[PDB]
Design a protein around this ligand. Sequence first.
Ligand SMILES: CCCCCCCCCCCCCCCCCC(=O)OCC(COC(=O)CCCCCCCCCCCCCCCCC)OC(=O)CCCCCCCCCCCCCCCCC
Ligand code: HEA
Ligand code: HEA
Ligand SMILES: CCCCC/C=C\C/C=C\C/C=C/C/C=C/CCCC(=O)O[C@H](COC(=O)CCCCCCCCCCCCCCCCC)COP(=O)(O)OCCN
Ligand SMILES: CCCCC/C=C\C/C=C\C/C=C\C/C=C\CCCC(=O)O[C@H](COC(=O)CCCCCCCCCCCCCCCCC)COP(=O)(O)OCCN
Ligand SMILES: CCCCC/C=C/C/C=C/CCCCCCCC(=O)O[C@H](COC(=O)CCCCCCCCCCCCCCC)COP(=O)(O)OCC[N+](C)(C)C
Ligand SMILES: CCCCCC/C=C/CCCCCCCCCC(=O)O[C@H](COC(=O)CCCCCCCCCCCCCCC)COP(=O)(O)OC[C@@H](O)CO
Ligand SMILES: CCCCCC/C=C\CCCCCCCCCC(=O)O[C@H](COC(=O)CCCCCCCCCCCCCCC)COP(=O)(O)OC[C@@H](O)CO
Ligand SMILES: CCCCCC/C=C\CCCCCCCCCC(=O)O[C@H](COC(=O)CCCCCCCCCCCCCCC)COP(=O)(O)OC[C@@H](O)CO
Ligand SMILES: CCCCCCCCCCO[C@@H]1O[C@H](CO)[C@@H](O[C@H]2O[C@H](CO)[C@@H](O)[C@H](O)[C@H]2O)[C@H](O)[C@H]1O
Ligand SMILES: CCCCCCCCCCO[C@@H]1O[C@H](CO)[C@@H](O[C@H]2O[C@H](CO)[C@@H](O)[C@H](O)[C@H]2O)[C@H](O)[C@H]1O
Ligand SMILES: C[C@H](CCC(=O)O)[C@H]1CC[C@H]2[C@@H]3[C@H](O)C[C@@H]4C[C@H](O)CC[C@]4(C)[C@H]3C[C@H](O)[C@]12C
Ligand SMILES: C[C@H](CCC(=O)O)[C@H]1CC[C@H]2[C@@H]3[C@H](O)C[C@@H]4C[C@H](O)CC[C@]4(C)[C@H]3C[C@H](O)[C@]12C
Ligand code: CUA
Ligand SMILES: [Cu+2]
Ligand SMILES: [Mg+2]
Ligand code: NA
Ligand code: NA
Ligand SMILES: [Zn+2]
Lengths: 259, 58, 84, 514, 79, 98, 46, 227, 43
Amino acid sequence: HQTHAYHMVNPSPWPLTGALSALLMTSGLTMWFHFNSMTLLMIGLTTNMLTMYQWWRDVIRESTFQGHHTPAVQKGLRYGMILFIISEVLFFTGFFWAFYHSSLAPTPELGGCWPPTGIHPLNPLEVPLLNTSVLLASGVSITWAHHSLMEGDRKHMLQALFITITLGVYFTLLQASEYYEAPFTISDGVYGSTFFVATGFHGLHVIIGSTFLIVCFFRQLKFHFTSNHHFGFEAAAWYWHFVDVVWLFLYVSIYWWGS
Amino acid sequence: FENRVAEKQKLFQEDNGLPVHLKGGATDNILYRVTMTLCLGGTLYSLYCLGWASFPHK
Amino acid sequence: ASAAKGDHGGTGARTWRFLTFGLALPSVALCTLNSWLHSGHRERPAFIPYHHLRIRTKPFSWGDGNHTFFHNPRVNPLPTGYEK
Amino acid sequence: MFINRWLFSTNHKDIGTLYLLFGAWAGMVGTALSLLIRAELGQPGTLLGDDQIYNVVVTAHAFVMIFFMVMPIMIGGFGNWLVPLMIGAPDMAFPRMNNMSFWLLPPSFLLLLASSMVEAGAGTGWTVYPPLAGNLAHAGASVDLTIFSLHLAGVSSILGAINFITTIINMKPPAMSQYQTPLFVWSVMITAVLLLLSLPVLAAGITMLLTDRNLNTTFFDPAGGGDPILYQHLFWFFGHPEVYILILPGFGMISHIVTYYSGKKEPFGYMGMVWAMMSIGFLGFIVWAHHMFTVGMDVDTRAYFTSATMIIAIPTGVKVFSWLATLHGGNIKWSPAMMWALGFIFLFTVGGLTGIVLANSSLDIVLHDTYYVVAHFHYVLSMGAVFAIMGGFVHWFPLFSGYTLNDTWAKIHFAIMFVGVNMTFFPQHFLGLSGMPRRYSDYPDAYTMWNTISSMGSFISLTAVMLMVFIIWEAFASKREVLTVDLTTTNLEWLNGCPPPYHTFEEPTYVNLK
Amino acid sequence: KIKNYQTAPFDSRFPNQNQTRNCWQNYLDFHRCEKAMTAKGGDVSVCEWYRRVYKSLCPISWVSTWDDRRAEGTFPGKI
Amino acid sequence: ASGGGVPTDEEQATGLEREVMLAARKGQDPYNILAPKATSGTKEDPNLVPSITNKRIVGCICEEDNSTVIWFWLHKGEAQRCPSCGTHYKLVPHQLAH
Amino acid sequence: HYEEGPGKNIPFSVENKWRLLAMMTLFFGSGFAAPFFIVRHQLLKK
Amino acid sequence: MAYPMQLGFQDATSPIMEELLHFHDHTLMIVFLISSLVLYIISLMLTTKLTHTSTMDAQEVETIWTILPAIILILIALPSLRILYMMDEINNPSLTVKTMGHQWYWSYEYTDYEDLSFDSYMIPTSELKPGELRLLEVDNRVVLPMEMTIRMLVSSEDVLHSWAVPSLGLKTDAIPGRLNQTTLMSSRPGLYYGQCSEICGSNHSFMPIVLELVPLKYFEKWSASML
Amino acid sequence: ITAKPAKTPTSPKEQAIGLSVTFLSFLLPAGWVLYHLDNYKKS
Ligand SMILES: CCCCCCCCCCCCCCCCCC(=O)OCC(COC(=O)CCCCCCCCCCCCCCCCC)OC(=O)CCCCCCCCCCCCCCCCC
Ligand code: HEA
Ligand code: HEA
Ligand SMILES: CCCCC/C=C\C/C=C\C/C=C/C/C=C/CCCC(=O)O[C@H](COC(=O)CCCCCCCCCCCCCCCCC)COP(=O)(O)OCCN
Ligand SMILES: CCCCC/C=C\C/C=C\C/C=C\C/C=C\CCCC(=O)O[C@H](COC(=O)CCCCCCCCCCCCCCCCC)COP(=O)(O)OCCN
Ligand SMILES: CCCCC/C=C/C/C=C/CCCCCCCC(=O)O[C@H](COC(=O)CCCCCCCCCCCCCCC)COP(=O)(O)OCC[N+](C)(C)C
Ligand SMILES: CCCCCC/C=C/CCCCCCCCCC(=O)O[C@H](COC(=O)CCCCCCCCCCCCCCC)COP(=O)(O)OC[C@@H](O)CO
Ligand SMILES: CCCCCC/C=C\CCCCCCCCCC(=O)O[C@H](COC(=O)CCCCCCCCCCCCCCC)COP(=O)(O)OC[C@@H](O)CO
Ligand SMILES: CCCCCC/C=C\CCCCCCCCCC(=O)O[C@H](COC(=O)CCCCCCCCCCCCCCC)COP(=O)(O)OC[C@@H](O)CO
Ligand SMILES: CCCCCCCCCCO[C@@H]1O[C@H](CO)[C@@H](O[C@H]2O[C@H](CO)[C@@H](O)[C@H](O)[C@H]2O)[C@H](O)[C@H]1O
Ligand SMILES: CCCCCCCCCCO[C@@H]1O[C@H](CO)[C@@H](O[C@H]2O[C@H](CO)[C@@H](O)[C@H](O)[C@H]2O)[C@H](O)[C@H]1O
Ligand SMILES: C[C@H](CCC(=O)O)[C@H]1CC[C@H]2[C@@H]3[C@H](O)C[C@@H]4C[C@H](O)CC[C@]4(C)[C@H]3C[C@H](O)[C@]12C
Ligand SMILES: C[C@H](CCC(=O)O)[C@H]1CC[C@H]2[C@@H]3[C@H](O)C[C@@H]4C[C@H](O)CC[C@]4(C)[C@H]3C[C@H](O)[C@]12C
Ligand code: CUA
Ligand SMILES: [Cu+2]
Ligand SMILES: [Mg+2]
Ligand code: NA
Ligand code: NA
Ligand SMILES: [Zn+2]
């Protein structure tokens, strides 16, 4: 029997199924890019979702249902989430470097100018500005949800969190429409490359963060959170503010300054 | 909805020796077998695909 | 363009709901208006087969290999120009 | 029970053991690749084929030694075994995520092996520069399998970094400050910070290469307005921190070994050692373009990268002198692990000094892309990182296994390896000064004598590697069980016996605050 | 004026190892000058200094690609 | 406006989290979250080291801000001295109802 | 529980030293041989 | 070129390369001294039965071994950067030559006056003439005028290469889409050899560079004859 | 460090066998590939 406060985790298959899912997704992408087949990739995506589902399910079982998240355990999870977000910031930093490298020194092939000849950027005062207001608003509403939770107010937590998720979904549909309507593509030189890969990874993180908020919404419906203990919500709110801040950098850099 | 966390706490704290990933009952076992079967089967398939791609095909 | 509201007795849920409905969502509604007043299709420019655009170094892994993933026939020309 | 224990582990020692076995197997692969390089160069003419098959071998040699041998052994192996025990913690912060960091590595290795079996392999150099690594000059799957191998290894180490930082910050005894934790623990924390910050940037760059190869982007393709040199910036922004990632845990183990076999209770200058590792970690992020002095950069940029690179000699020199001051007055035990550490101190210093030669961008014009660079980095890697690994392995093998090595054989092994590596790499300085390029499968005739000697050196090192396997076999074959270990009062990781029980520190240590 | 041209002189606008923009600028300047002269019925001979500098500096294949793109209507620089 | 419906920890914390929370209310630290405060360390006034078994490892920081910690097993019975600096420690074994 | 102690905290048996020699021989030998056979494979293609 | 059993740099052919030799001598002396000092101190720490194992104060001694290395670094950096900037100094070339890397050979363009360009390929070992050097000779040498300041511009029409001539202290990467500049000045006539210095595929080992430095009048007549 | 005498002592003859087997496990497969290189290239 232990007399420290930390969590000895039961032996688990999910590290291995996750590692194999990574093999299947990467060899799947290889098969898709080179051997005209999606089979391995669909298997890998499926086992990856199953792995995430059961792993985080088990974390909920360990904490809400079994009590293993003492304050010391929670403190470690706070550090882990902050470090994870730091690594994602550096990942985006590489795409911002690529954007500034190409746009500050536009080569002769581009016309020696930025934006390149033949590129007609979106108007940053139209849908991109609307998107900015949507994610900024969702930062306000998730803050309302957090205070409601701390104050023990179930109904207003749910309402504010629903609003936050709805705005996330609105951003995602607006961006999907903008992608379809854009007159330039990912194959339109370095302008299309930087634009779509940087906003596209951001878009994926908006989807990830919205999924996390939705997990939190159903956990709240099921009363898992207490007014003092709700780290999944805290982590999803941190991740959501990260996604909002990456957007503001994208808007200022690519949409506005880069227009 | 009603708060049924106490019931789930009883279930997952039951002294039955089961690891947490199976402690929900028989459905956990099924989802586990499906996951592991897809992973292990998929991994064999990927080795097959390596073998295939390792040689030219005219 | 600075700020200028002025609450802060002790931030709470009531204040953040006030901000949500009194400033954040009205901003979204106003930009939603602005956007639905500047919707409407711009005229597509002459096609010019610029060599730094419509890059194809390897076919795409979908379709006929020559259409981008969110290809829009109205505004996205192929390397040989707009589709009929 | 076997699958539960070894495939579903949540235990830091067993996962540490898994990493040590994985890295030992990788070390064999990387050794064989190194002998194929030196066979090709061991006499003038062509042995295998042209530069493609040659540089698939070179490329794989480097990725295997770096990502599947050094980093899994130092961080995954010694890190997982030693860090929780050295702070009295019951395991790592995220014991189940820890297991996924391990299990991502066999698939990463499989993808690299697949890259070399399909098409004509990725013959790019471990830097994977475009356009050679792009879809026209390296059409087909090999480079994409390489990129994906790096993705998985990158994810493994980023999650491991999160684990190690969290564990080291959060799970010490409540009375122990960060300035009361052993230097090897510091060295792992600092390496993990470097991994956390640098690998996402590599991931961004190689993902851009992937999309240039498959999605018709043009980040690195001048036809779309891209620039091959942007790839180099992104790669080396990772690549210089990476070599400090490769050496810092080594520095940590060296501090423990030198202290222990000097009969000292503590290293000389503990806070200076902490300062030096932190300074190295920080400076290691602001120097990357010393890998790019010949690409056409402005002169003031070259002046800056010359000057910033040389600064790192100051904290590194504090560490060397502090190791010498730890030996000073010691009751020196001439154990095999001590010999590895002493060989480290000297050969690492030589390789660091030739790195300072290369930091001078004016001279680097002539030395860049020559064997002088190869000589610099094999002095710090084959006679630095590897010597620290072998030192740590012989020192802590009785803790991990409960059995003793034969010290006379371990001293023979050190002696053979020491001759072999110096015979391999010392002549490479002359080849580099006199202008032999890197990544060549054959050389003008004048360069024959030193290439011949270098290749003979590589076979001596092969003999040492074979002998190492026999020595480990002999230890497990004879089963000499450990009884008593000296100096446990300042080496907590021994205090639970050899091997320690599966669960240690179920009851934490008692440390008061006063 | 400045004949006995030997090669392109040092140009403070392009003092660094990367000379791509020097070749490009003089190529543009020459063809800009030639368009202006030929239109208003002047003499392209005044464009000669740009012509000699770009021919000295620019890879043959760059000039040739750029010329091909001007004739095709796909040259992305402004002339 | 205002309503309830969110469980408190007092209502819903379970397992070890609840044990830690309830002991903290009583000012007790069965799970070693806090650093113990030293006594004078004499043979008369030894540091009292709780344990759920008959030995536990002690780490002794001899002088304030030493970076070197001295580690040793403390066994049930007569007080023992820290090898480096002599500070006394005595084990006080119990069952985890403490 | 799990077995503890020397020879028991490892995923391979050390109960018979000659079976162990064979296992270690396959293990390290397969790693060292793999690059030679990959080279052969690439040579036999073209 | 390099010669058998060579230990150091090829003999300097340009004043910049001579500068590098003296700076390397300066730096190598320091490297030898520091590495010797460390080896010697190691041996000294290890050769006595006398002991002193109590705690040792570090403050005073770490001044020494921070300040002395800082000083040494500055003694390296000062002549290092002097040469750096002198290599960058304006010099007014009297000729520009371009070289384009290719898989696997170099082409050369001398377009100051006429359209002169040609390819330059390794001589196959089976076709060397007696006395010629394996893997180093080319069919068409880069003829250049001796004792004059030459602007070399380097690029590539496919993958990366790098254009190097060690005895003139030259190495400039060949990057497609980019025109890198270096300056070349030979104090002597003769033949100066280099090799492609950026991995570029199957025949990276086999695309060398040969400069042929002759008096200006000979270069002019050769240039005329190469049209 | 101190240790018990070997529980299963490995005599010089046994060590010679282990070392010979170890060495041959590295040398024979590589030797076979390298011996036949010409047959691979000449193919
Ligand atoms: C340093 C690692 C350990 C050493 C390993 C090998 C040790 C043996 C050699 C080595 C014995 C130690 C003496 C080193 C230099 C010997 C060659 C030389 O004359 O070098 C000259 C220069 C430039 O040359 C020139 O422009 C002028 C040429 C002058 C020609 C006159 C004839 C000279 C004699 C011929 C040399 C024989 C070739 C040796 C062939 C050697 C093949 C292995 O080349 C270079 O820069 C080489 C750059 C090397 C940078 C690393 C320095 C580390 C030194 C450690 C010494 C501490 C004590 C060692 C004490 C050693 C015991 C630990
Ligand atoms: C363990 C790995 C490791 C380590 C620790 C280092 C450490 C250093 N290296 Fe690195 N290096 C590599 C692995 C490593 N290197 C690799 C793999 C490459 C090639 C990558 C590739 O192209 O594939 C490379 C390439 C490389 C280059 C590029 C050369 C080129 O490609 O043209 C340069 C240039 O500046 C460089 C410099 C340095 C310096 C200054 C240090 C310093 O950190 C060393 C400081 C140490 C000392 C100086 C010794 C101890 C000090 C004293 C005893 C004090 C007194 C000393 C003085 C006063 C000088 N290295
Ligand atoms: C850790 C990094 C590492 C290590 C250890 C080595 C080890 C060796 N390397 Fe290394 N090498 C590189 C990293 C390394 N190399 C890199 C990055 C490159 C550049 C690649 C490129 O240009 O793209 C390179 C390039 C390179 C070349 C230049 C190829 C070229 O330019 O054409 C050569 C040539 O001789 C060479 C030879 C050797 C040899 C003979 C060894 C021998 O010393 C190896 C001998 C064996 C060992 C050191 C044993 C290995 C370890 C174990 C078996 C582990 C034991 C496990 C436990 C105890 C748990 N290497
Ligand atoms: C393509 C179309 C868009 C797609 C979808 C995009 C995103 C949608 C986002 C989610 C929206 C969800 C809405 C949920 C609304 C909740 C209404 C019910 C709750 C409620 O009405 O609560 C009241 C707030 O009301 C309230 O008017 C809430 C009113 C909200 C107002 C929003 C904005 C419209 C206002 C127009 C005014 C313009 C003012 C301009 C000047 C502004 C200067 C700053 C507070 O009352 P209470 O008495 O204290 O009660 C406490 C118990 N509830
Ligand atoms: C909110 C709107 C939707 C946002 C999210 C949309 C999907 C993004 C999915 C994943 C994003 C991840 C990688 C991004 C790669 C490029 C996608 C860029 C975003 C995008 O969707 O770009 C689209 C192109 O998609 C294409 O090529 C094909 C896209 C599908 C193939 C992806 C290939 C896999 C790449 C994997 C990268 C490796 C993973 C990273 C590993 C990191 C490890 C640490 C743009 O369409 P277009 O028709 O060119 O122009 C529009 C003209 N009307
Ligand atoms: C390549 C790297 C080299 C670059 C150049 C570096 C050169 C370094 C040279 C430094 C020389 C410094 C020598 C210091 C030795 C003298 C101190 C000593 O060795 O003596 C100790 C002093 O310890 C005290 O307090 C004070 C603290 C402890 C002093 C001993 C530790 C200092 C040892 C430095 C060792 C350096 C080893 C070589 C590293 C290069 C003990 O002295 P006390 O009188 O207190 O006790 C004696 C008892 N009585 C009083 C009854 C006699
Ligand atoms: C942040 C969220 C709200 C954002 C709302 C927008 C706010 C502005 C921020 C960005 C400011 C720079 C934007 C530059 C855009 C281009 C316009 C420009 O740069 O204009 C110049 C002045 O700009 C200048 O930034 C002068 C400086 C601009 C000041 C704008 C007003 C706000 C200043 C106070 C802000 C509050 C304090 C914030 C806390 C520190 C000159 O005028 P032009 O019109 O060029 O005419 C020249 C004629 O020859 C053309 O025919
Ligand atoms: C289209 C793309 C598909 C593929 C991508 C991924 C898709 C979706 C992923 C969405 C992420 C959902 C994560 C759900 C986590 C639920 C588990 C959880 O939230 O667990 C909480 C702990 O937090 C914790 O582990 C924190 C766990 C944090 C994990 C998540 C961080 C996001 C990671 C996403 C992966 C990003 C990769 C991006 C690469 C470019 C449980 O503790 P509490 O909440 O305090 O409860 C206890 C109380 O009840 C006691 O009173
Ligand atoms: C080219 C295509 C390549 C694709 C490669 C994809 C590879 C990976 C497959 C990933 C499968 C993921 C499965 C879910 C993993 C959840 C991990 C998790 O949530 O880990 C948590 C710790 O990490 C923390 O919090 C904070 C960290 C949360 C991390 C969540 C997972 C991220 C996975 C992607 C990471 C890289 C992202 C990009 C960085 C640049 C919990 O730690 P455990 O030890 O479990 O439990 C501890 C117990 O006390 C909890 O009760
Ligand atoms: C539980 C573990 C699961 C393991 C499952 C293993 C499944 C094996 C199914 C075999 O599928 C092969 O793969 C491709 C698709 O499935 C097909 O190729 C074809 O498939 C594509 C269909 O989208 C086309 O694009 C290409 O033309 C063509 O190569 C091919 O005929 C088919 O035999
Ligand atoms: C870089 C690492 C490599 C290090 C060098 C290896 C050192 C020697 C290993 C010996 O390897 C064996 O050598 C034999 C020759 O001596 C080969 O037999 C070959 O030659 C024999 C004699 O000609 C024939 O009997 C066999 O049938 C024929 O396979 C045999 O296959 C090979 O296993
Ligand atoms: C049924 C539930 C009451 C909470 C509880 O006591 O069970 C109520 C309270 C808050 C409600 C949610 C919030 O009002 C926000 C959303 C508002 C939409 O108009 C309906 C769905 C919406 C998602 C609501 C669904 C549902 O009726 C909720 C979840
Ligand atoms: C102040 C700090 C920690 C002291 C402590 O609390 O124990 C110490 C530890 C290592 C010290 C540094 C190292 O000893 C290296 C340098 C030594 C020089 O003599 C002074 C600056 C110098 C950069 C030192 C400054 C300062 O005294 C440091 C940074
Ligand atoms: Cu061209 Cu190497
Ligand atoms: Cu570096
Ligand atoms: Mg290079
Ligand atoms: Na909270
Ligand atoms: Na050869
Ligand atoms: Zn004490």
